[model samples]
Target: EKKVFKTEWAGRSLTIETGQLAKQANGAVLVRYGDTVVLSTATASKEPRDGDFFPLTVNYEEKMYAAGDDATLTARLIDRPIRPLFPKGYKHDVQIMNMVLSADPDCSPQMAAMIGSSMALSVSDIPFQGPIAGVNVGYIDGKYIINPTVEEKEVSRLDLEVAGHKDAVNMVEAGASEITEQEMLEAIFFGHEEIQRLVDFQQQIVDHIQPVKQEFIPAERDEALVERVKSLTEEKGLKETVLTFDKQQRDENLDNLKEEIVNEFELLIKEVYAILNELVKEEVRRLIADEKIRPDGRKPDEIRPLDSEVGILPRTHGSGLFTRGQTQALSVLTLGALKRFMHHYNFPNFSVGETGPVRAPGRREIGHGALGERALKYIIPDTADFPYTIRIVSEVLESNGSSSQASICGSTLALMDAGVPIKAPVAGIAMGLVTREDSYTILTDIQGMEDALGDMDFKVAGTKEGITAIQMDIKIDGLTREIIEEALEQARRGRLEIMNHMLQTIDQPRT
Candidate 1:
């Protein structure tokens, strides 16, 4: 039976209806939040996908507005939080898509779309522990406000976007005014309680009607293949090589080890490498947990080396280059006539990967494109004051890890060098994780290898005072308060440290 549910929340009304559209797919839902409307739906393949892990894709489409980029960016935001909850071993090819049909500038179509996702997935035959909630928290005048308006977000020093349930937080994306740790926590906990309301509204639909989830059994490790790969890598001292050398050498060595491990077994398909990775991942996790060793030989809390400079491009509106370890991004600032290009705010460029002649933009660039936009647009002089269109383009010069994040640091430097009116310079970092059955470790300034093998990858961007942007993706059952709290503090320290050197490159926005 088709189900419909509604509620009035935070001064706006929200409605979720199913069975009326996309009924043939696994699940579909249409939502009305305030005056805005959007649809979310999910579908999955019956058989196992070609790749080893689950194949899920989320595509968010908005009708109008670069404000065009806004829809794609929101798609990534929704994708991040929803991905972490699937249990190990389900390899279905699933696709969840959300689209904005109408906008009243009403409330957050982003959050509304996410809410619809929960409904769509819940009603489908997908294996998930969902029915989650999200919030946009604002800090102003010594208090926190939920789902603040566009105007409120402008004046507030903190713009925090968090999602999850009553006890755990699965996803977070925030921009702050250099707020303190406790202050952010206060907002988080407060927001956590309110998540209950949204979850409850969705629960009402699921309680009366639910799908019969298809049975899924996780893949078991091949003990013989695993032992073979381990013994060979150990004989080669692969761990020692990774710990001793720089990123390139370590990467080359690891690739060589994987190739050797796979070829020795006489396997031709890429699946063998995936099988080997399963073995290597545990070794990486155990080394961190027991041996106190990281893939890059740094302490758990240490960050990669960083360097920055401003005015690298002489003729552009502004230019800044930022490099951390092997990851490098150059931000070019372009000033446009406000009358001609007022809305070209946050944009992402895909110079990060150099695989072929050309390619499509992935989620990494799509999400990274918005951070500098989020971090800088807040500080940009009003149209009345600066009277120019501000645009920043980030080029991924060298990428191992955190190239998208480097763009933020570089963008700030470019903004300052260009003498654009600004208050605080922004910076960013990428966080990673190594987790076992019961324990986990958090890493700062992660690279491609760690990101690929690590249990979780979280990105934080902001100024020295506090955080401005956060993006977290976990491959497990979300996170506990302890892990989330520690990661938040760790990210804060890393952000401050990066800012210290970043300010050295060019202190203070142009007066």
Candidate 2:
């Protein structure tokens, strides 16, 4: 089927059409939200798989030209080599790959890819249990923000990701919060409500311009195969697990179990793999829905326990190490000359591919790194306040979740330890989401698996008084103002909790 539809929202025109490109796929759609456009196509096997699992792949690739670059410094028009090589060892099921940029660098193209994929899947005949919504949460002015623009994120204290079904949150990732768990929960709830508006908008688009359905192969069931594998693995029960309060011990135990399972089930891997994935997902959903508890036994809004050490290294101008549960970061601060403060602004590097380094710091990296950097930057005293050209490096030591926010906490402590008279302590936290239709749930202080499997990634950063920076990346379409408003309110609570923790470690700025 071929069709075109146009509309306007938020002072921008949007045009959506089908059958114009990627006709070979099960379904294809070209979506334009403002001048930022995306081409999305969905494809699935026509014959059902020989197994009982759904093998779905969602990829969002960025074309360098989309951001108005003629060619990358490496003289390539697009990133070619990185595609076939999967170095990250990502799981094959339910993949979402993005190019990480847009034609207009100011706008977030990665978020667009997420929206396009979700819309394509929702409108297509694919039997996905989805319509999951995602949103980015940012903190500034002691407030949480949703879908903040490039400028709004500069001073944010947190960068969080929230994703969920319509009724409850399914995923969260955050990097700020010197505060309590209740405050984090408030931010999560705010994000979930805001994401629902975007979901509703996408539904409207699908309803207005119904596209043709594509045929896909249904997953096949093999009861005999399942039973055979189950019988062989029944006696090899998992080792009796004990929940240790120590982050390192907990990590070691989890790692051991994972290694043991992979080794023991090596022969029957194919049959047992999908089952494990489903089991984990189900267990998580159950815990959240029925018990309001997390895998590590934390409350929905609760942050993991925190510990900090300032001046861990005497040689550095400023140094601190912060640990939250299993996640840890070492932050070092440096005072540089004016000449060293200016960074290079160049396009085209001879080292890489078409989508390789461009002449400019395009929007993606500058936006992301700047947000990450700012969550820590807020604690640095100004030249008038302390007179230093500051630079901080945060090395992630052990990452379970929200390491970037840990960097913020570490930076603050380091600055204080170094005798920089910062006005106050600053911290960061991430938020996650899981949503469908009208039901959704939000998670605070997210874990790694939640980030990998959930929809939105919202990062909020700020001081005790207000938010300084924010960044949001979603898997669904754009969000609603209502949800954005709620996230800001929730952020304040989280920030306060984090602030209290910091004060306990070092009550005030040292002269």
Candidate 3:
């Protein structure tokens, strides 16, 4: 019952085999590309989990036999592209495990495992709308190399990873040496071309297997009860209740509405809440798409209020605070190791005013810190030019959305305030997307609510000259080239606007 599929990509032999290992799982594949091999498995719980969101976990198990770095980041990378392919309201507990069986320094095992995960899910009975694929691109000697070797990567100007389904692009993680927008765009498309080939190759394996998918039908609800809730929401002005400019008051309004809806209906509590969730999400998206009305009453491309302060903390070597609407980040710098420069992000419970137990940094903190560090790495002076090791800690004092971008801005201000005369200042912005039938709206500096319900989270960080770092994830099927292009264009405007405010606080690094 085992089947094998093979292809030649970038002058290397690529092979995928299925129905051999981990047969108990819903789907599994053994992928071999170049000199590397990876085993990827996808499994799902028999029954749906009791949660508002899907309980999907992606683990990239890096074994001693294989060399890898930061499993969490790799897992997050794979999670982004595949997560969106799942149908909405799917609460099933799905797990995708990728194990590097054999690693090759020349070729990327990450790319191999990425392909394996897509193949594994496509051949499984889980109702996944994915046959997605991913690729890593490098720019060396003025040419784009698909899945470049380790040596080539050492001298490459770009480290770009692109993932997608068939024709559209979905997830992108890149850190470049201040490459221009047009060049970055070209590199993304260059990587996407290879992804398309990988996707088509996975489809061939899927066609051969022709696996039957399991049905995931939601529980039947009372039609009369649903109609009542819908009509009540419309009459009570759910739109007005949710579109308030203030986050705290808007939250209170929603909470009040939830109680009122439940009390008035005097029916199933879960049913009312679930119905309201759907109705509220739809209303917001419709207003944004059809009427161009944002929840905060800003234009589609408008950013939130910007404010910044430097040298705020007396004891610290350098301190800066950046605020974007409700989101705030206080970054403190300390110059000290092998790690010439580093950035760390902290989000405590008080940031969101929630009562929770104190805990160590989680995946979100690590990912955000890494992204902020990447954005500034290009702007930092070379070790030879300026030999002072620098460290910046960004504390998220408040949050609505894009706190990570806030950290980037705050850290830049702190770097300059600390008299680290190495490079130019950098800024970051988070872009959002809301898609409808035959239409989509790109939002600049999305807030908490839009982030939760929006179709995309695209973060771009850089200087005025060009992009240094970029990361994008989506909840929809995929994004067309036009959406990505426009998002980058819009992000530049927002990034510059925030930088202007930072400059007002500290025009130049202290001498």
Candidate 4:
């Protein structure tokens, strides 16, 4: 009825023990690493309700007892890495929940929480294509430490989280100290070698218990019909039309394209769109690989012209507007009681439910907002040092791709404009990779078209001296160490250029 697994790494014992709680859920596991512990479970509806896509949600209950903060944010952490592994067309309502069962301030609960989610889904009735394992690496004295404790982390310059299967790494998030790409790759492999152990142990648990798996065949479309429709669209220059326009424009065109097709498809429009989506991507990538021409007709590494201004508003502590190509972000800063520091951001259309100057917000509300928040956190003075709460709201006036990083840049510039004495001004940039076979191109300051056609989105945020945060999402299986190096170098160059421009408006934070 119960299967258990554990490992000793870096003077710590990490364990996953199942069948002890939440039996009603499709799968459940209790995870303990170091002295910290967590409970995780996964559940799925046998048949999805009326929806166009898979409704997958990951939740981590806010535990008053946990040593760390914000389980809500951690919920998104577990959600990001695992969501991609689910097979396409599996449109089911699935949920994963992690609860901190024990608190260990000396250790962080993130790794424990991630493993708990992976094990819970692996043993559940749902067909999660992963026994994915997660590990955290800290760089100290030229060595990578596995699942380092908070004490170890304090002395470390690099803190990285790696999650993957046996063949490749899927997700990577890090805060590093100007780490070279080689050192980063080494640190990743260091975590990778250890994560393999966790994956092996998970496989053993599955073999020992042979947990029941539900028979779920996701919705599928007939390709014969899809191809016939796709051929028609390709003949009409779908790629040419899509490449020239911005994201919003492309959407409108696709809307009209769909409108035109429904008359012919009537009832089969869903499948019609499905095939068109893939064909659109293929055509985009094909143009890049074969002809070296991007959809937007820009050379690799070229940046759209940027226009920006500062101190544009009188009431706010500081404000800045940054527009590059079609992507625009307006950042506003407020300073008050340290306790009052809060971030409220709004996207383009979502409006006026209005939470006291703010309104209804989606994932971008939390997700991209966090992106900017984290990029700036390290630059701000300690709470005890400055003793004022700083709330900076970034309104994405328009968006194409990499708006989050742009918002980060705008927020940093606004903080400086407001005369907030930040340590070192920080800047953020999003680098994209287009790869097929051995051929690859790294794009700097990518816009909508490149993002839609790219294989990788590697975003880096940092001060001039070092990196504070890195968020990477790969559409393909994984990136080689070489690609990692090239993107980092290119991003650094682009970031420096961007910082030079930002300084033109305001040089330093108010000291």
lDDT of 4 by residue, 18-70 (tens): 88789999999998877788999999986766635778898887467664225
On a 0 to 1 TM-score scale, where does candidate 4 land against the true structure? 0.89
Clashes of 3: 0
The full ranking of all candidates by TM-score, starting with the best, is 3, 4, 1, 2
| Per-residue lDDT of 404 in model 1 | 64
1-511: candidate 3 lDDT, tens digit per residue = 7778899978899999998899999999999888889999999999988757799999897679775236888888999999888876789999999999888868788888888899889999998887888899999888999988888889999999999988688899999887887888899999888888888878877887889999867677688888999898888889898788899898889888877888876236777899888888898999899889898898799898888999999988899899999999999999874478889999999998888998888888989999999999889988886787899999999999899999999999999989888578999999999989878899999998998889889999999888999999988788888888899999989988888888889999899
TM-score per model over all chains: 0.88, 0.59, 0.96, 0.89
In candidate 1, where is summed lDDT lowest over 10 consecutive residues? Answer: 339-348
Best by TM-score: 3
Q: Where does model 4 exceed 4 Å of error?
A: 49-52, 65-69, 177-179, 212-224, 337-344, 348-363, 381-389, 448-454
lDDT accuracy of residue 146 in candidate 2 = 72
* Candidate 3 Cα misplacement greater than 4 A, ranges: 67-69, 218-226, 266-268
Q: Backbone clashes in each candidate structure, one number apiece?
A: 9, 91, 0, 1
